[PDB]
Amino acid sequence: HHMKNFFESPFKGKIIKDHIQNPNIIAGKYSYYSGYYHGHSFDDCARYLLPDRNDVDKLIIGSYCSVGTGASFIMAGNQGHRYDWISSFPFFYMNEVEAFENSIDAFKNAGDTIIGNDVWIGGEAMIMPGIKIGDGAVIGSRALVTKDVEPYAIVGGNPAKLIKKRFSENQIAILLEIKWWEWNEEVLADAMPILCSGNIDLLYKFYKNI
């Protein structure tokens, strides 16, 4: 029952879609997890995600995302606790107690957890159940994300709050139209020096000439 480190070094991550074993995690190309400081593979970032059921909330991750060490995505909805029932205790799941035999299942799904494309998640951020995070967002280290995150928003804190957006509203609108994460690798390679800059207007010109 020993705990092992899946990462040889702080300075090497692992591409998520190449290493996950949980079929209820879906991950896009190139997105990676850098998990040296917490040891476990990315599968264990998806807490309480049942691997053997097709009717539970899934964890969906876009392309070109960066996930920091010990980030977690809380799955399984309410985990069998209803705070609007008289007790939050999950009687239905403790079936070794005769007194609990007529208990009722409190479990509720929350909806899928959806991480967009080009999302940078800092170390030990924690995403609550059912949350949607827009394309281009930045989730600060240790952010406790209780609400959906707008595209290109930088959020931080516990609870997480908007700090600022990465670009202006008009610039964001341009990026959401052109969706560079959908480009094939030949087109992406040609755009690479522009993508490694802030020149959204130039990328727009590039896109129009594809």
Numbering used by the authors: -1 to 208
Text from the published report:
Several antibiotic resistance genes are found within the E. anophelis genome, including a chloramphenicol acetyltransferase (CAT). CATs play important roles in antibiotic resistance and can be transferred in genetic mobile elements. They catalyse the acetylation of the antibiotic chloramphenicol, thereby reducing its effectiveness as a viable drug for therapy. Homologs of this protein are important for bacterial Cm antibiotic resistance because they acetylate the 3′-hydroxyl group of Cm. Additionally, Type A CATs form a distinct structural group compared to Type B and C. All three types of proteins are trimers, but Type B and C adopt a hexapeptide repeat structural fold, which is not found in Type A.
Here, we determined the high-resolution crystal structure of a CAT protein from the E. anophelis NUHP1 strain that caused a Singaporean outbreak. The electron density map allowed all residues of the protein (1-208) to be modeled. A single protein monomer was present in the asymmetric unit of the crystal with the topology shown in Fig. 2A. The monomer contained two main domains: (1) a left-handed β-helix core (15 β-strands spanning residues 12-163) forms a prism at the center of the monomer and contains two extended loop regions (44-56 and 72-110), and (2) a C-terminal α-helical domain comprised of three α-helices (spanning residues 164-208). The only biological assembly predicted from PISA for the E. anophelis CAT enzyme was a trimer, which is identical to all other structurally characterized CAT enzymes. In our E. anophelis CAT structure, we found one interface mediating the trimer formation. In total, the interface forms 21 hydrogen bonds, two salt bridges, and buries 1699.8 Å2 of solvent accessible surface area (ASA). Therefore, the results of the sequence and structural comparisons indicate the E. anophelis protein is most likely a Type B CAT. The residues that could potentially hydrogen bond with Cm in the binding site of the E. anophelis structure include Pro8, Gly11, Tyr30, and Ser32 from one monomer and His79 from a second monomer. These residues are all identical in the CAT enzyme from P. aeruginosa (PDB ID: 2XAT29).
